[PDB]
Amino acid sequence: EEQDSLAAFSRIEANITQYDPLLDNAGKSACTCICLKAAEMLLEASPDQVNAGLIDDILVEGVADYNRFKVEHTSVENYELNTFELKRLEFRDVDNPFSAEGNPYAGTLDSFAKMMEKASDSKDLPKPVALVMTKSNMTITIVIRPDGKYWLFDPHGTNGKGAYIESCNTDELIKKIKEIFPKTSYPGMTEDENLGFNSFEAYAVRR
């Protein structure tokens, strides 16, 4: 009496199609709002609650919240986190000399694994905790679960569906990010070009 879920499958996809009018009308600018809705709903969930209908709910309610607030700057900071029942937690790259307290975690794609290790082994970040990560105006949500697994929620639109969630171990998560946010690299690329093509920012939130 239950739908297929993350308890038995490592990937679950929405029923809502990639080009459904609700998603097509809302732009890619709605991705950050949808990802904050994903944090809200997934941080409250257990693996067997995460089925295709829950992903559908994230998309629809995420778009509803986005339409209420639109009219663009669509950073996590532009949304009022209490309306998502979320709390922001301090989380940044203290090793980066340009970073300041209160900044998000910012770096190049090469720093992804380090970010995840700091997030998973930090006392200041309880579990479950979500990272909302933006690269080149596209956003994903990564849920760090107390069972050591990671849920990757990706609203980019894949295989004809509006979003999917994948449950990953540490190394598989690293490998999947390389596919979602491919790094730009060519012989002779400067660090200035690397920062311009390959930077991301991430915010940490909890319920």
Numbering used by the authors: 283 to 353, 358 to 493
The authors write:
Deubiquitinating enzymes (DUBs) cleave peptide- and isopeptide-bonds downstream of ubiquitin. By performing a comprehensive bioinformatical screen, followed by biochemical and structural characterization of interesting candidates, we were able to identify active members of this family in a wide range of eukaryotic species and a few host-associated bacteria. Due to the similarity to the herpesvirus proteins, we refer to this extended enzyme family as VTD (for Viral Tegument-like Deubiquitinases). While some VTD activities resemble viral tegument DUBs in that they favor K48-linked ubiquitin chains, other members are highly specific for K6- or K63-linked ubiquitin chains.
In the di-ubiquitin cleavage assay, Wc-VTD1 showed a strong preference for K6-linked chains. In order to gain insight into the functional differences of bacterial VTDs in comparison to their relatives from viruses and transposons, the structure of Wc-VTD1 was solved in the unbound form at 1.8 Å resolution as well as in a covalent complex with ubiquitin at 1.9 Å resolution. The tertiary structure contains nine α-helices and seven β-strands, adopting a fold with overall similarity to the viral and transposon-encoded VTDs. The catalytic triad is formed by Cys319, Asp440, and His442. As previously observed in the M48 crystal structure, the conformation of the catalytic histidine appears as non-productive for catalysis due to the large distance to the cysteine. The structures in the unbound and complexed state can be superimposed with an RMS distance of 0.538 Å over 144 Cα-atoms excluding some 40 residues, thus indicating little overall conformational changes upon binding to the Ub-PA substrate. On the opposite side, helix α1 (residues 302 to 305) together with the following amino acids 306 to 311 is also shifted by a distance of about 8 Å. It is located on the surface rather distant from the active site and is involved in the crystal contacts between the two crystallographically independent molecules in the apo structure. In fact, the available structure and mutagenesis data suggest an attractive three-step model for explaining the K6 specificity of Wc-VTD1: In the apo-form, the α1 and α9 helices are far apart and the catalytic histidine residue is in a non-productive conformation.
